[PDB]
Design a protein around this ligand. Structure first.
Ligand SMILES: Nc1nc(N)c2nc(CN3c4ccccc4C=Cc4cc(OCCCC(=O)O)ccc43)cnc2n1
Length: 186
């Protein structure tokens, strides 16, 4: 099992969701970026693992689920079986990262990508050691009822040129944003 990563798109007001939807209108090229970052593994014969909370799983548009080309694992204490075609269920990130060592997943998973929601991102941010955050900073406020946690710049550093990540400001539907990559050690 490879590198642990979060990926999020977040408004200037730190928002990531509202009533089970995104806060902003669809940004197709931003969705393409999510898809290419989470799907791409260069270890031959393996796939990345995408980890999401119960509510994020049900919220993602159903005709995209499970996320193709990726192993889909849902975190819940409530569910007793993986919901709707997800491959795996665990109670927590720690349990998920354990399962990754068991025979069924051991020679199957390259990178891990945490894809939401808020309590899952908090768990990952609280997880000791290396974590890379791929943050799309949407440069205006949108009304949100769920939020991404603070990024501690004493722990994370921006990585200003990242291969396969556009540096310049992007725009779709009049809404500007920037793809950013952060990394922590500790
Ligand atoms: N950078 C980044 N990181 C994320 N975690 C991220 N998550 C979503 C969540 N999402 C949504 C959650 C709830 C309602 C609506 C959502 C709208 C779109 C999608 C689409 C996803 O993959 C399908 C690709 C669509 C295509 O083939 O064109 C996956 C998540 C997601 C959207 N953009 C993101 N962008």
């Amino acid at each position: 099992v490879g590198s642990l990563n979060c990926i999020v798109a977040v408004s200037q007001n730190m928002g990531i969701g509202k009533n089970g939807d995104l806060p902003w209108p669809p940004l197709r090229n931003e969705f393409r970026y999510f898809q290419r970052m989470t799907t791409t593994s260069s270890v031959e014969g393996k796939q990345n693992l995408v980890i999401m909370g119960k509510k994020t799983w049900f919220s993602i548009p159903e005709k995209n689920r499970p996320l193709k080309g990726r192993i889909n694992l849902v975190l819940s204490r409530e569910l007793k079986e993986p919901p709707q075609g997800a491959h795996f269920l665990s109670r927590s990130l720690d349990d998920a990262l354990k399962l990754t060592e068991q025979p069924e997943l051991a020679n199957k998973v390259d990178m891990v990508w945490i894809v939401g929601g808020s309590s899952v991102y908090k768990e990952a941010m609280n997880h000791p050691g290396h974590l890379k955050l791929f943050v799309t900073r949407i440069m205006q406020d949108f009304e949100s009822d769920t939020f991404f946690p603070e990024i501690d710049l004493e722990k994370y550093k921006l990585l200003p040129e990242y291969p396969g990540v556009l540096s310049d400001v992007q725009e779709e539907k009049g809404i500007k944003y920037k793809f950013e990559v952060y990394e922590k050690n500790d």
